[PDB]
Amino acid sequence: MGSMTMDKSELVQKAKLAEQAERYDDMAAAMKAVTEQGHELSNEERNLLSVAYKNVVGARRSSWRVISSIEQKTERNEKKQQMGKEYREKIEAELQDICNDVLELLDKYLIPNATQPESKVFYLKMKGDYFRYLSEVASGDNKQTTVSNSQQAYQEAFEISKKEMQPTHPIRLGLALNFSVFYYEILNSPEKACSLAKTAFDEAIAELDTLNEESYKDSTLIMQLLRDNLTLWTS
Amino acid sequence: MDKSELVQKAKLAEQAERYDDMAAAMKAVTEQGHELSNEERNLLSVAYKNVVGARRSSWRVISSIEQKTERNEKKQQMGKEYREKIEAELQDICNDVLELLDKYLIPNATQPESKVFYLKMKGDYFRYLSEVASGDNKQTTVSNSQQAYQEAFEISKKEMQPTHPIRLGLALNFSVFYYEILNSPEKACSLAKTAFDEAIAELDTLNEESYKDSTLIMQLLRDNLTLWTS
């Protein structure tokens, strides 16, 4: 048959099977079709979409780092260096195809259909993430553009989260974590990265008393990542 | 791309865990028609082992979900159709390997060691076809798997030492074939036990430091034997 003759619940069932089979390309294709039907995603559907693309793009980012590390230590052989460079470029082309598809989904469906501030922050953070993934491999003026677009998306998310969400909210915390990584690694601005992460951590530490058992687990999960990053960057 | 560029691409793809790329590169090397070196032979084997292994894993998961699905005919039927897609990919992969074996690798193998290595591989990939086959196809794949393993077994018995890792690996996979495909635990246990005992009797005369690859496989033989007896 095909995705254009399937209803949403069938595509979601397909995504869940693909997830269990670790066929993440299939899972992303199913959730992409769900998103393209134009309706606001449920929490379950948003989880399936995000997990699929995290794994699809994640495999390429990981391959790209491996290939780039090998290029630094490769003997100066013309055939070998041309092979590694065309191989890195192949991976770069796939990564850019993946990220452009996610960013198209975000701008055409996910962000415009978001009816609640928690959803808006989530998708703007996602936009910031996927422009950051482009920035990881970009060069020259294109790098200037993807870096600027990452920063603008994160910043828009950051402003909404400070107005509509408590400092212990997992999405606000996760936004701070990833925006801090962006400043550290992409903008090479470690002081801004450390101050952004420390402020988010401290302000959340200050309000753990307000949380029940379940919320406390959710929040401290990501506060520990913020502490881990601070420890890594300042030791 | 010449052979040197393709082998370098395969090593890069291996490091990047891009095994479909790796298998495509080593397939192209093989189709150039020359006898593979030990290095190229291992790259080809690793690549396709990982390519078919990902599909075997997905197949086992989707099969499991399909079989355990109660009171949901729509999920059950979708699981069936997904399984059949994975089966078709698995059959295409195995077909490619068997074609390389029949056309290039086995006809160019002159040394007993190479013959056994590639006949074992032919047994393995017919075994993987047998994991998903049914009916007359199944009879054909099981018989062809057995034929290849038995041919490799008799060569390795005549021409290779009991501690040779290729001889030990064939005994391991051949015993797995008996256990899992033919449902013959007694044949599987006798094969694994004899290969282990013959290896140990020879290894006792030697310094094991140089036989780390053999002792690893010997441990796998012992592990299967203890699980299968129990």
Binding site: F122, D129, G174, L177, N178, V181, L225, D228 | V176, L220
Partner: peptide
């Protein structure tokens, strides 16, 4: 049975 630390980023998965 046959023969054979980096900085952190996070994705939020609610429920």
């Amino acid at each position: 049975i046959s023969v054979i630390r980096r900085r952190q980023s996070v994705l939020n998965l609610m429920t």
